[PDB]
């Protein structure tokens, strides 16, 4: 419901445009491969925060106790905090005061 894949920027805005506060949804960034974005219809303005997400479905495992080469977990990350996945992320934005007021429900129903 909240997980919108392949959602064009122009589309998101066109959907949130004129949408009461509380409406939010995730979408793949255009100039950011394998990166999610938090959409939120503010007071006459739809904001979009950049989020990072793992590429493939499989979660990449860690290396031996020895020095790890190019160590880069696939966990979720956003701002000065990380998360297990999008679900947890969206919840954060709804529980935090990122944009105007807190989120209510996803564009869907």
């Amino acid at each position: 419901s909240w997980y919108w894949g392949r959602l064009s920027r122009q589309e998101a805005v066109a959907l949130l445009q004129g949408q009461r506060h509380g409406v939010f949804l995730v979408r793949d960034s255009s100039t950011s491969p394998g990166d999610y974005v938090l959409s939120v219809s503010e007071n006459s303005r739809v904001s979009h925060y950049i989020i990072n997400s793992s590429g493939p479905r499989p979660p990449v495992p860690p290396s031996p106790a020895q020095p790890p080469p190019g160590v880069s977990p696939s966990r979720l990350r956003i701002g000065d905090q990380e998360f297990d996945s999008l679900p947890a992320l969206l919840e954060f934005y709804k529980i935090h005061y990122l944009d105007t007021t807190t989120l209510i429900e996803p564009v869907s129903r």
Binding site: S29, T31, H48, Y49, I50, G79
Partner: peptide
Amino acid sequence: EPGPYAQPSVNTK
């Protein structure tokens, strides 16, 4: 220049 997105940080100088 480096303003591709918002990026929730709230720090600045």
